[PDB]
Symmetry: D2
Subunit: 422 residues, 4 copies
Amino acid sequence: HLMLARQLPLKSVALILAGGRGTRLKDLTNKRAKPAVHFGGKFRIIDFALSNCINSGIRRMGVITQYQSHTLVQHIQRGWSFFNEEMNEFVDLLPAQQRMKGENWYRGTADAVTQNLDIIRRYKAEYVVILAGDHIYKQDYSRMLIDHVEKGARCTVACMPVPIEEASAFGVMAVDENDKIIEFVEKPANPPSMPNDPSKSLASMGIYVFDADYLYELLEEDDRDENSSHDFGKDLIPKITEAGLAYAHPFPLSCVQSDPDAEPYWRDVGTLEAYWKANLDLASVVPELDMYDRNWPIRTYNESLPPAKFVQDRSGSHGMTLNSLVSGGCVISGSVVVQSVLFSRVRVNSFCNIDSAVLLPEVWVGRSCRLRRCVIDRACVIPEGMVIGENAEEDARRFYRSEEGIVLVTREMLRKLGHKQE
Amino acid sequence: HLMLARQLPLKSVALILAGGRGTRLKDLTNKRAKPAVHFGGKFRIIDFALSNCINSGIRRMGVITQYQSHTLVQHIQRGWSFFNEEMNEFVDLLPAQQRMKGENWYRGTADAVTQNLDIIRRYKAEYVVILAGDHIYKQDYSRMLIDHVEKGARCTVACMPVPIEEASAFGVMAVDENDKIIEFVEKPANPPSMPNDPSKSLASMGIYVFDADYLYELLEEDDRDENSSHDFGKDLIPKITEAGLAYAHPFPLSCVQSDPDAEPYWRDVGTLEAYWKANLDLASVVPELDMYDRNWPIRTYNESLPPAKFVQDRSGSHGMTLNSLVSGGCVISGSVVVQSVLFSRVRVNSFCNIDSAVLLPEVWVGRSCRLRRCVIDRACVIPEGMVIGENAEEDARRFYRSEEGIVLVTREMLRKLGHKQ
Amino acid sequence: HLMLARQLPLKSVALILAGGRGTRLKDLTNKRAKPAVHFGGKFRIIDFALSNCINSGIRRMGVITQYQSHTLVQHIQRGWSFFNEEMNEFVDLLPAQRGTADAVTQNLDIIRRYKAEYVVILAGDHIYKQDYSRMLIDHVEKGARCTVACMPVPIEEASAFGVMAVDENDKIIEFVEKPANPPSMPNDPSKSLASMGIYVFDADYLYELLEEDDRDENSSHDFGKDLIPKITEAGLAYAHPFPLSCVQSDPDAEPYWRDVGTLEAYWKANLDLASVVPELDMYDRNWPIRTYNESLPPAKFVQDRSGSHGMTLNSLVSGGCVISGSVVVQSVLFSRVRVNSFCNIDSAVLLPEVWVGRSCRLRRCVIDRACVIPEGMVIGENAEEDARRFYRSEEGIVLVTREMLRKLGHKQE
Amino acid sequence: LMLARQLPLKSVALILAGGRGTRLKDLTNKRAKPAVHFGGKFRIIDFALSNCINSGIRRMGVITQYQSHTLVQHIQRGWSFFNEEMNEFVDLLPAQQRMKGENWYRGTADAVTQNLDIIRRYKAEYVVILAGDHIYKQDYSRMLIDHVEKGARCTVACMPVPIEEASAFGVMAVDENDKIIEFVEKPANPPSMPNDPSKSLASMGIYVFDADYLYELLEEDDRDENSSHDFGKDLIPKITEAGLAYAHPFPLSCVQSDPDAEPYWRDVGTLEAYWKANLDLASVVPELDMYDRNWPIRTYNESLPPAKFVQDRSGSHGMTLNSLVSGGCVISGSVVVQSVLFSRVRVNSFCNIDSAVLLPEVWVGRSCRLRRCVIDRACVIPEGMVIGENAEEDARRFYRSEEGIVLVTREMLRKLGHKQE
Ligand SMILES: Nc1ncnc2c1ncn2[C@@H]1O[C@H](COP(=O)(O)O)[C@@H](O)[C@H]1O
Ligand SMILES: Nc1ncnc2c1ncn2[C@@H]1O[C@H](COP(=O)(O)O)[C@@H](O)[C@H]1O
Ligand SMILES: Nc1ncnc2c1ncn2[C@@H]1O[C@H](COP(=O)(O)O)[C@@H](O)[C@H]1O
Ligand SMILES: Nc1ncnc2c1ncn2[C@@H]1O[C@H](COP(=O)(O)O)[C@@H](O)[C@H]1O
Ligand SMILES: OC[C@H]1O[C@@](CO)(O[C@H]2O[C@H](CO)[C@@H](O)[C@H](O)[C@H]2O)[C@@H](O)[C@@H]1O
């Protein structure tokens, strides 16, 4: 009658690291934090980490923000503020400030947790689950908690093989036959390859399980360390590995997926192309990421919208759709929409051709537009007859064009070109 | 009198009569009350009266149910239970029992209010707004409250000209130069015409404003009256008219509409054909009912659904859509959808042709189906290759077929034909 | 396998039988169902079964209602309507119009669509804390088709319960419903092994069992009288000792469970919360009880008409109360209770909105909703006078309602 | 006709809930002033927000001019029940404290200017500017009517204050039409009111603006090299010079039960004033009526056990005189007089508490005596400690005001060697 599998999440608290400032998504995060980035027609990226907590039995969450992110706070307020504190459940907004240890010496990810240590101790959790709020994945944290307790570990790090050519952006580790971490290097310019596979490196997913009291001591010591950068990957994980108290958790043990024969899904959405790719996956016939799984639902802000409306064009002609998502509030006049994802309240006027495009909420596409392989940002007013995705040189002049050929259009770019955004 | 326009809704309580069976809707109301009938891809009919209350400043509502309406109670529970009683706001579920006065003498709508009189008196309301919960319309009751007080009336009846050929279903009235009601007949077989116009009759909309303490007295007397059918239209309104204390409120004074040049919108959704018509109106290019007006929004249960998904069919071909509404959770594989309204989580498989059809939530349409001029009820599993709307006699044998040719399909009908549900 | 303890509640649905009339509660249930009976200064009885479900991981609940259900439905609407169905959680209001099993059978179409693997049947008119997830594990490990939670009870009151006999494997061997001559437990004649009205069912097995019962013209359609004996004869029923799953702070204490059948038991259970060390711990954050969080002003104590202070001894005073001096002893005051000057209130339960006039003395009594006690009235000191004006139980507990006071000529407006 | 009801619907309220300060001493070391506990169960910002709701203004922007953890959490818990589709919300609008010089602070108007993009999209016709750190009841809809009837571009709520305290306020002079003729912000020598030298006509920091006019004014002010970007110091005098500013006497819209009483308004600037305003609610006849159902104050509805009174260790009863005891409290015997105990306050045996304000989660040890003091959140008072009886000893251990009111925090106790966990 052992109940440990059910008791561990109740004794745990999840801490979601929700963003230090960055700019790898370019203008896409100019006016919004990365965890607040739109995804899947109706979600924001942070919804996945939070929904993973709820579905894993962890109903106490702390979302740590490193600056005043308006749209992230509003999203938490409107879609993640339904809890009753008397039932041992909450979503706390924990403000961190970016602190410097020197003129150009930044304090790290661990410092954001250290600043809020007084509030976190009062949670009286036995286990602390540290999460990155800017990744898209489904994982059962209760299974990782079970693995963490079974191994007698003080710190357990979720791990996953990644292509070695992209491993320099990750913490890379080496483990023994017991999944105990033997070596750990943070963002190596020369990433060690996995034994028996030089094409891959064993990478850290930024997902940790901690003994609570051990984490408090470690942060107290780290805060007083004059040599530390106060970063989980750069400072804390190597130190725990050296003490022999750190273990690895292979992601397939806890990744939640409908098709058991498939590869484990995990997207860090680092580049504009990866973001564009991850959204369009949901529009394909067989998406890699299953969002119709009632057994692991993703919670978000339930926006009240009119049903998607399709009307004849100015010539009275019908519209055509091929492998596309049309969110609520959209109004499409004829046109051709193919391999695309349209967020809420998107207006597509007559005689349009939209192919492999991601249109964020409130986008207004004027008459006779052709958009290909692009991302149209919030509330853009595309002027009539505009063509995007057909002339590489012209696209790069007007907007942002990635090396792979993916175009990003914002209100500021269009206004710069003389197209009114009212 | 400075702040009266704002104070009146705060001193008012709305009673929504939601016991309607709507038998003329046939199997559509076999397992649900008429106020719980689906509409507009994402609403139920009762949402309009309740949203009208909220937008009018009347945040205290009593929904009277004349039996055990499970799905009506659940809808109120899901989408209309967000109120905080300490802020002088609530939506109360007030159960009434259907009572008989004789062998086949049914007590009326007023009896349902009388049964709950103890609870209603405790509201301490100064004005009571009586509403029908089975109609679709937008109205600002605060304008009617101002009109009611300025006229010094004890009872104010919202009225609107209707075609005389349909006026026998309504209470018909005649008014003087001051909007005071002079004559009133309830559901006349030969409806009196308006003096200005023999093509129209001045009809009652079943929407009343009452002086609260006057309403209580009237119901107490009516409960003891051995000659009364205990009905608002058949009994109470004629009595108030005879006393000279009843006044009329022209609907255009308070009807909310985007286009001021248009005709006032009001649908009683009495027949299957009218219900089918009112739904498809929203799919047209310029709908008569504007559901995109942010200035008078309609509140409902905000169901969490995946975005509407369109995928290629088995042959890898695209889909076509013409003047149609596709709600969230739907997944459409190719096919042709024209002049149709699809509610939530409707599944349309490959090679389908759907024309002038209303598909209620969770309908599963199999491969190679053709549906025309029909209403498909909740959770129907249409078997592969089924054709509807092309053979009039065949449709009438399998399902219900309206006089004008509109077909209604339910789970029970398909189960009788041997199609597993 | 290793995740079974967590996955069983997610595959379960709880059905709360909340049509209870509570005949032995007299006027206390004249205008309200027994699950809607006030308790603990701020709760309704049904809150415990529902809170037990939430704390057990069972977030899908069906509340079956029937008699005098207005105040019960409103309570569910106010305090138990915060769920988001997309996260596989709800509290359904299932109206029933023949015994307890018939109410479940009537709603069988809706319940099947829950697609539950296990069904937990609960009585919504009892006060207790239980972890149903532990009972679910025991149900699966025993391979049972039906598991019945059991507890030893004094044999002199065992005729009100279903009594059972079990073997060495907790398999139910004999079962009799409400026996006039209750069999005693082996090795203890002072006690009988009683059923708590709490069952765990294999879902598909329960549906079949209800289908057969509906077609049985000889059945009374009752869980205890009809279904449990049938399962016992087939050898498919098992017993679950309540201490396995009973939730309690003090591990040395006796398992807490109250059916509050009589006015005296209801009065007793309320005053227990006012004692120094209550048997029922309502300060345990590890098993909290959810209810309607009513917005109330903080309890206000003011000087009496003579400018004197007030005295309190082992009492609970809910929000919105305003007490003018007076003496309140061993009492429980619900929300918005007004106690005027020069009053003496001892061993009394005052339900919400009670107005106590000046110079009143109330002892060993329960005053019902919104009663307006006139000035100088004395209750609990003259037995015969109490019995003439109000209801007086055999043990001497007095029940006062607004209707009784109105009959005596005391205005209730 | 319907103007009285339409004006709040066309308005948006901006609550200024930021601005660092230290007039409350350690009381605001770890919380913003709008987040300061009050009345046993409220935070100060609840009044402005409740005034908006009760005035018909359901769209609110709370500007937080820095990172106030406990203020955001309170909004998240008690003011996040809105449905945006029904034209209602409480927005958290982040402002940062901006400098114009080495010690030249940009003012309250700058915080509104920073969020001008978000505010314009509200598409409001009128903007109501509110201070989120004051305690008062006011019907903003009455002030909106007065603003429109006077044809004003800006209307300033005003009231007479004692001239010896008027230097902390904006002081104004008005003509016979309540038009503002002279305005000076925080004068060292405040002008007296005509016909009463004991009083000055003061600004309450409550403004009604024509929305587009305010946006123009803020655009110009953001580009003004001479402006401190403050409503009182910069904007109001500028509008006054143009002759477009009007005054609104507070009694026109102040909400109060007793019509014969003086208008209630507290800025709670000092520890003594804060202590005073709390204890007023514990008196026999409080100046501020918190039992008025017609103007309820909304807050975080925290789930708490009923206030529990138990015998002390010697089995003796407890005594209470003119006190408020919030939910979750557990008092063991003891004597509680003229005090206000917030939620979850634990008072052990043999205690004497007089004229004291005990904030949430305070644990008072055995045999303690507290007088004329405010004990902050979660203080663990050690056994036998005495406060409020020795002025010199009190000033050494804690903070002691001029008037003799003592403030105790967890840090002060831990500094004295008394464990706080
Ligand atoms: N309809 C809109 N028009 C212009 N700006 C907007 C609109 N909606 C949001 N924004 C702003 O654009 C940025 C992106 O916000 P969001 O899409 O909510 O993450 C934020 O600064 C928003 O305030
Ligand atoms: N998916 C479904 N399958 C079968 N019956 C259903 C389904 N959804 C609802 N019902 C039943 O249909 C009746 C009315 O449904 P509705 O008003 O659409 O909720 C009720 O008896 C429901 O229990
Ligand atoms: N203040 C009140 N005055 C009179 N009757 C009431 C009051 N509050 C509730 N009731 C009624 O008393 C009965 C039982 O109330 P309750 O305590 O809510 O279960 C129901 O019929 C209620 O409608
Ligand atoms: N129980 C507690 N013990 C210690 N500090 C607390 C406690 N509750 C809140 N605080 C802190 O006290 C400060 C102000 O609290 P409050 O404004 O009451 O939420 C914040 O820094 C809180 O984190
Ligand atoms: O995950 C968010 C963010 O954290 C950083 C460090 O700032 O990297 C962390 O997470 C990585 C996986 O996402 C780990 O591999 C790494 O060890 C850890 O420091 C950023 O690189 C990343 O975007």
